[PDB]
Design a binder for this molecule. Structure first.
Ligand SMILES: Cc1cc2nc3c(=O)[nH]c(=O)nc-3n(C[C@H](O)[C@H](O)[C@H](O)COP(=O)(O)OP(=O)(O)OC[C@H]3O[C@@H](n4cnc5c(N)ncnc54)[C@H](O)[C@@H]3O)c2cc1C
Ligand code: SF4
Ligand code: SF4
Lengths: 470, 109
C-alpha cells in the first residue's frame, strides 16, 4: 500500500480568486471519496514515523491512514479521536506545512507530503455526517466541584476530559458565545462558525455547566472560586497588546488588530454591532496598512481585502523565511491581490490628528551568529512615506498583569509576566490552582493548548484523588 | 606587506601596516579599508591606489572572496559578501606603475 511511486500528490480543491475575494466562505471544499482511497494510499507506512514525533499531540497517523486506504471508517474514526480532541478544527488550523506534513519522509525525498490534514478533516466530517458521534457521560458520577477560568480550546478540552473522568466542572469566561477566541479571534474565512458551535453543543450535551458572560477579575475572586470548588484551573489566555510610540502616534484612525478582527468579522456575521458603520472599521476604499508579521497580520490583510475593495500593503521587519506563519497563507494572500513589503519598519505616523501616511525606513540583516540571531541595522538610504488613512497595529501579545491585578497577591510569575507550572503536575505556586493554555508558554498554536489541557486534566484528577485519599 | 612583490594576487581585509607595497613591481592588490586611512600608510613610489570601476576586476575579487569563505567558514567574510553592493566601494585597488599599458584588461576607462 505504498503507492507514492506512481500516483502524484494533489490537494482536494481550490476556488479561484474570482469569487473568493467577495464571500466569506471557505477556500477548501471537502475531500472526495475516490480521492480519499487514492491519497490515503499514498503514504508509505514508514517505520519510525516522523509524522508522529513532530506532531504536538502525537496521534497514531499511519494506523487510520492504512484504515482509510482500506475503508472501515468506523474504527478509523474511533482510533483517530481516541487521542486528540477537537479533531476537525485542530486538523484544519494546524500549520501542517511545518508541524506534521512538513516532516513526512516522503516529503524529504521531494516526492511530496502526504495530505494528512485533509485526511483528518475528511475522516472527522464523514464520521459526524452519519451519526457515528455521541457525548461522553461518566458512569457512576462521583460528584465534585471543579472550575476552569477561560473557555479557550485548552479549557474546553480539560472540561470534556474531566467530565469523562467523573467530575462536575464549571466554565467561566468573559464572552457570551462560548468557545474561546475561536468564535471571535479566528476569522471565518479560514474556519466556519458551524464546527465550533457543533462541538460546544456536544460538550454541553455531556453534562457540563457553563457560566457565560462573567468577569472573574471583577465578578468574584480566586479565594471564593477555590472555596466553592475543590480545584481550579486558570486558562485565561493572553489579551494584552504591544504598541509603538513613534512621533505622531496616538492620533485618530489607528487601532489594534484584535478588536477590528472580532467585531468586523464575527459580530458582522451576527449582524448586531453598529461600530462596523459607526466606527472607522469599514471598507475605506482608499488604503489600509498593517504592521507586524505574525499570523494576525496575515488574517488581518485577508479580512481587509474581503470586507470591501481596497488596496492594502503590509510592513514587516524580518525577511520572508523567518516569518512564523505558513507559506501557503502568504501564497493565498498574494493570489488575492495584496502587496508585501519585506524588511521594513515604521518610524513615524504623519498626519494632522488623522493618519495621512507612514514614514518608514529599510533595515538589513547580517549573518547569523553562533546562537543563530541575525541582528538588524537601519540603512537610512531610503526612508519613504506610504499613503494610507488607517493602520493596524498587530504586534503580538504578552501576559496581562495576572498576579496583582486579577486576584492574587500570592501568585508567582517570571520576568516575562507569565506564571510557572511543574513539568510533571502542572500545578502552580498556589495549591488547588493549576494552569494550562497559552498563559504558561506565550503566543502559541491550538494543538499546544490541547496537549496542555489534556495533561492538566490528568494532573487535576490525580491530585484530587490524592487529596481525597485522606 | 607585499614588499618587492612581482606577480600574483593578495587580498587583504582590515588595517594595513606602514610602508605597505614598498618596491612593488608587478601584480595587483586589493585592500578593504574602512576609514580612508590608507593614503597615510602606502608608499607611492612605483604604485598607485585607486577605486574599482571595471566589472571584470569586481567579479574576480568577488570570486576570490567567495572561495575564501567557502574554504575557511569565516563569518566576517560572509558579512562582507552579504553587503557586497555597499562594501564594494570601500575597496582600494593597488596597481604598479608598470602594468598601466601591458595589462590585457584596461585598468582605466
Ligand atoms: C492558524 C492559526 C491562526 C491563529 N490566529 C490567531 C489570531 O488571529 N489571533 C490570536 O490571538 N491568536 C491566533 N492564533 C493563536 C491561537 O488562537 C491561540 O494561541 C490559542 O487559541 C490559545 O488558546 P487558549 O486555550 O490558551 O485560550 P485563549 O484562546 O488564549 O483564551 C482563553 C480564554 O479565556 C477567556 N478570558 C480572557 N480574559 C479572561 C478573564 N479575565 N477572565 C476569564 N476568562 C477570560 C478568553 O475569552 C478565552 O475564551 C492562531 C493560531 C493558529 C494555529
Ligand atoms: S507521515 Fe511519513 S512516515 Fe508517517 S505514514 Fe506518512 S509517509 Fe509514512
Ligand atoms: S493537524 Fe495537528 S494533529 Fe493533525 S497532523 Fe497536523 S499537527 Fe498533527
Amino acid at each position: 500500500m505504498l503507492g507514492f511511486v506512481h500516483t502524484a500528490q494533489r490537494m482536494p480543491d481550490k476556488r479561484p480568486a474570482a469569487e473568493r475575494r467577495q464571500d466569506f466562505a471557505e477556500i477548501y471544499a471537502r475531500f472526495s471519496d475516490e480521492r480519499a482511497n487514492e491519497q490515503a494510499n499514498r503514504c508509505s507506512q514508514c517505520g519510525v514515523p516522523f509524522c508522529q514525533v513532530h506532531c504536538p499531540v502525537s496521534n497514531n497517523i499511519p494506523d487510520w491512514l492504512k484504515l482509510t486506504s482500506e475503508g472501515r471508517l468506523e474504527e478509523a474514526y474511533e482510533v483517530s479521536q481516541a487521542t486528540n480532541n477537537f479533531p476537525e478544527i485542530c486538523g484544519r488550523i494546524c500549520p501542517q506545512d511545518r508541524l506534521c506534513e512538513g516532516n513526512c519522509v516522503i516529503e524529504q525525498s521531494t516526492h511530496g507530503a502526504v495530505t494528512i490534514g485533509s485526511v483528518e478533516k475528511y475522516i472527522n466530517d464523514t464520521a459526524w455526517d452519519q451519526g457515528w458521534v455521541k457525548p461522553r457521560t461518566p458512569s457512576r458520577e462521583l460528584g465534585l466541584s471543579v472550575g476552569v477560568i477561560g473557555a479557550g480550546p485548552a479549557g474546553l478540552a480539560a472540561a470534556e476530559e474531566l467530565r469523562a473522568k467523573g467530575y462536575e466542572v464549571h466554565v467561566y469566561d468573559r464572552y457570551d458565545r462560548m468557545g474561546g477566541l475561536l468564535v471571535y479571534g479566528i476569522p471565518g474565512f479560514k474556519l466556519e462558525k458551524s464546527v465550533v458551535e457543533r462541538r460546544v453543543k456536544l460538550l454541553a450535551d455531556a453534562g457540563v455547566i457553563y457560566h457565560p458572560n462573567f468577569e472573574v477579575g471583577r465578578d468574584a475572586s480566586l479565594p471564593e472560586l477555590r472555596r466553592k470548588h475543590v480545584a481550579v484551573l486558570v486558562a485565561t489566555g493572553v489579551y494584552k497588546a504591544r504598541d509603538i510610540k513613534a512621533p505622531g502616534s496616538g492620533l485618530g484612525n489607528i487601532v489594534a488588530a484584535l478588536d477590528y478582527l472580532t467585531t468586523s468579522n464575527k459580530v458582522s456575521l451576527g449582524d448586531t454591532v453598529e461600530a462596523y458603520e459607526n466606527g472607522s472599521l469599514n471598507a475605506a476604499g482608499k488604503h489600509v496598512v498593517v504592521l507586524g508579521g505574525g499570523d494576525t497580520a496575515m488574517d488581518c490583510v485577508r479580512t481587509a481585502i474581503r470586507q470591501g475593495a481596497t488596496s492594502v500593503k503590509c510592513l514587516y521587519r524580518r525577511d520572508r523565511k523567518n516569518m512564523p506563519g505558513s507559506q501557503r497563507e502568504v501564497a493565498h494572500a498574494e493570489e488575492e491581490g495584496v502587496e508585501f513589503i519585506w524588511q521594513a519598519a515604521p518610524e513615524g505616523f504623519t498626519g494632522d490628528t488623522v493618519v495621512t501616511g507612514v514614514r518608514a525606513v529599510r533595515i538589513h540583516l547580517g549573518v547569523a551568529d553562533a546562537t543563530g540571531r541575525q541582528t538588524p541595522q537601519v540603512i537610512e538610504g531610503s526612508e519613504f512615506t506610504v499613503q494610507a488613512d488607517l493602520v493596524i497595529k498587530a504586534l503580538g501579545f504578552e501576559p496581562e498583569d495576572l498576579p496583582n491585578a486579577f486576584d492574587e497577591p500570592e501568585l508567582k510569575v517570571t520576568r516575562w509576566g507569565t506564571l510557572l507550572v511543574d513539568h510533571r503536575t502542572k500545578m502552580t505556586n498556589m495549591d488547588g490552582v493549576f494552569a494550562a493554555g497559552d498563559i504558561v508558554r506565550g503566543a502559541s498554536l491550538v494543538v499546544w493548548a490541547i496537549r496542555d489541557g489534556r495533561d492538566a486534566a490528568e494532573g487535576i484528577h490525580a491530585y484530587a484523588k490524592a487529596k481525597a485519599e485522606a | 606587506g607585499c614588499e618587492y612583490m612581482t606577480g600574483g594576487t593578495a587580498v587583504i581585509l582590515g588595517r594595513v601596516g606602514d610602508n605597505f607595497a614598498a618596491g612593488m613591481t608587478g601584480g595587483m592588490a586589493y585592500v578593504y579599508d574602512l576609514d580612508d586611512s590608507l593614503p597615510l600608510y602606502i608608499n607611492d613610489e612605483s604604485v598607485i591606489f585607486q577605486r574599482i570601476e571595471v566589472g571584470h576586476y569586481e567579479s574576480q575579487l568577488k570570486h576570490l572572496i567567495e572561495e575564501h569563505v567557502t574554504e575557511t567558514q569565516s563569518r566576517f567574510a560572509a558579512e562582507i559578501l552579504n553587503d557586497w553592493a555597499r562594501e564594494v566601494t570601500k575597496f582600494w585597488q593597488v596597481v604598479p606603475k608598470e602594468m598601466l599599458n601591458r595589462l590585457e584588461v584596461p585598468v582605466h576607462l
